């Protein structure tokens, strides 16, 4: 009927969490994309600020519904496209387990990694020291606990909560790489996620673009 | 049958978002409380760290389900206690609208206000300057847009998304008060929230405790 429109830039880990979800749900053909290029300041145009006063990506518009957080976009796409499949959130406890880990990404992992990555990119951080990376390492410690108790981040099956987290892990991993000695379950989970058939197009392309910008700033 | 247990300290805005939700849903007698006192470091005890490696409140345990983010706790309590009432999230678009504003609180308003409040309390900030408060004021600007387009934060009815946001607004308002000239819709919404019959017990008690600690540090 009516197709959701995803406003996006794939250098963003929040955006790539959604792109991974879209591919995993098999709904690439049901979700139209609209590029909003951050480095060219397209997120500050009047139309986009009216759509989202946070002037941030991703945004999903579906009819008159406007969602302005990747984690809300992901749960909504699950509800309307994934009810009868491997990513279903119909059961209340399963939905809460998944939402719990989405909150972990939004409020812990993404918050802490974004501080480091933005600071490096805007040159306010010119040398990474121990204090810069401790909050990220503490988030890795929590993730390692979760992946000791279940095979994937929210339960023993892959869920949509694995996607925002791997989008963040593949971003801050550029500056804070996983040690297999320190975080063995997280390192093995990360390698497993990288083997998903849609990982290259939905996540690695944007990671590669970010890595190029980081190398230039840091040289 | 089996009662959820809420691990809590009401000086915390995330906790008070849940306490407001519990009162609004009429389920105070269905949710057992377990005090975890932050100032006495009870959140660092081995049992609690095993329950939640983030060593933070609130936590909800319901049978074997352990939720470790106020926003996930609130949506879960809606699903299992509020399906047939004024706070229902059964409709997918309504659920997404509410979740969208929960994400705003968790990832924007709470993140920005907590930085300021924690910094004042640990004395790392000894004088509030313009740069300290600009991110909070930008969050107020977004809230004002939301409350121009709907009567409450997520739609024209009160929802559970109003509760985490008012818990934060009543905390950082101590140092960054709302101007009725700058944010008229937000100021009127805030006064309306303060008139809810459960606001005093569920939120003001904890705000009062925090205000006392702030005054002492800042004198
Ligand atoms: N919690 C939000 C975070 C969104 C966000 O911060 N997006 C960034 C890119 S990673 C952005 O568009 N920033 C633009 C700006 O800050 O002006 C989500 O998960 O969608
Ligand atoms: N996103 C979390 C935030 C929880 C949080 O940060 N709680 C604080 C109190 S406001 C805490 O318990 N901090 C203890 C610590 O940082 O060790 C939620 O909404 O539940
Ligand atoms: Ca198309
Ligand atoms: Ca161009
Ligand atoms: Ca225009
Ligand atoms: Ca009781
Ligand atoms: Ca005591
Ligand atoms: Ca013990």
A163 neighbors A74 (Cβ within 8 angstroms): yes
Mutating to test ligand 2, I would choose from B10, B12, B163 the residue with most ligand atoms within 8 A of its C-beta, which is B12
> Which B positions 130-189 lie with beta carbon below 8 A of chain A?
141-142, 145
Q: How far apart are CA A212 and CA A178, in angstroms?
A: 20
Is the Cα dihedral A74, A76, A78, A82 positive or negative?
negative
DSSP per residue over B116-156, as a string? HHHHHHTTS-SS--HHHHHHHHHHHHHHHHHHHHSSSSSSS
B110 neighbors B14 (Cβ within 8 angstroms): yes
Q: How far apart are CA B202 and CA B182, in angstroms?
A: 28
A43 neighbors A88 (Cβ within 8 angstroms): no
CB within 8 A of A180, min separation 6: which ones?
A187, A188
A chain contacts of residue B65, beta-carbon cutoff 8 Å: 93, 96-97
First to last CA, chain A: 50
This entry's atomic model was obtained through X-ray
Q: Please, what is the Cα angle at B163 between B161 and B169, to 5 degrees?
A: 110
From B8, B12, B11, B56, select the one nearest B31 (Cα to Cα). Answer: B8
From B145, B58, B49, select the one nearest B110 (Cα to Cα). Answer: B58
From A207, A202, A170, A203, select the one nearest A186 (Cα to Cα). Answer: A170
Residue of B nearest to A100 (CA): B72
Which two structure tokens, joined as six digits, stand for B122? 């640990």
CA of B10 to the centre of ligand 7 (A): 15
A17 neighbors A167 (Cβ within 8 angstroms): yes
Taking the CA of B41 as reference, the closest ligand is 2
From A58, A107, A54, A115, select the one nearest B110 (Cα to Cα). Answer: A107
- Residue B196, CA distances (Å) to A105, B8, B128, B158 in order: 32, 22, 31, 11
CB within 8 A of B107, min separation 6: which ones?
A69, A71, A106, A107, A110, A111
CB within 8 A of A216, min separation 6: which ones?
none
DSSP 8-state assignment for residue A29: G
Alpha helices in chain B (DSSP H): 13-24, 46-51, 70-81, 92-104, 110-121, 130-149, 162-172, 184-194, 199, 205-218
Q: Please, what is the Cα angle at B136 between B133 and B142, to 5 degrees?
A: 145
Which two structure tokens, joined as six digits, stand for B151? 């009567």
Distance from CA of B217 to the nearest CA of A (A): 25
Q: How far apart are CA A17 and CA A103, in angstroms?
A: 13
Angle between helices B205-218 and B13-24 (to 10 degrees): 160
Alpha helices in chain A (DSSP H): 13-24, 46-51, 70-81, 92-104, 110-121, 130-149, 162-172, 184-194, 199, 205-218
B chain contacts of residue A104, beta-carbon cutoff 8 Å: 54, 68-69
> Can you tell me which atom of ligand 2 is nearest the CA of B12?
10
CA of B38 to the centre of ligand 2 (A): 10
Q: How many CB pairs under 8 A join A and B?
A: 87
Angle between helices A130-149 and A110-121 (to 10 degrees): 150
First to last CA, chain B: 50
DSSP per residue over A31-56, as a string? SEEEE--TTTTGGGSHHHHHH-TT--
Strand partners, A5: A32, A61
DSSP 8-state assignment for residue A59: E
Chain B CB within 8 Å of residue A80 CB: yes
Q: Tokens 């550029």 belong to which residue? A: A174
From the number of C-beta atoms within 10 Å of its C-beta (0-12, 13-18, 19+), residue A191 rates as exposed
């Amino acid at each position: 009927m009516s197709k959701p429109v995803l406003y996006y830039d794939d250098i963003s880990p929040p955006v790539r969490g959604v792109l991974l979800t879209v591919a995993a749900l098999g709904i690439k053909d049901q979700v139209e994309l609209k590029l909003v290029r951050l480095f060219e300041r397209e997120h500050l145009l009047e139309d986009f600020v009216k759509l989202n006063p946070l002037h941030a990506v991703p945004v999903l518009k579906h009819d008159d519904l406007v969602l302005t957080d990747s984690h809300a976009i992901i749960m909504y796409l699950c509800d309307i496209f994934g009810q009868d499949g491997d990513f279903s959130l119909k059961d209340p406890k399963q939905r809460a387990r998944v939402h719990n880990r989405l909150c972990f990404n939004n409020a812990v992992l993404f918050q802490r990694e974004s501080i480091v990555m933005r600071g490096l990119i805007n040159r306010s951080i010119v040398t990474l020291e121990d204090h810069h990376l401790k909050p990220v390492q503490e988030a890795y410690d929590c993730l390692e606990v979760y992946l000791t108790n279940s095979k994937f981040v929210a339960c023993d099956q892959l869920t949509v909560a694995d996607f925002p987290i791997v989008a963040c892990m593949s971003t801050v991993g550029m500056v804070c790489p996983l040690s297999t000695s320190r975080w063995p379950k997280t390192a093995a989970w990360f390698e497993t996620m990288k083997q998903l058939p849609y990982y290259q197009q939905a996540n690695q392309v944007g990671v590669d673009k970010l890595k190029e910008r980081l190398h230039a700033v840091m040289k």
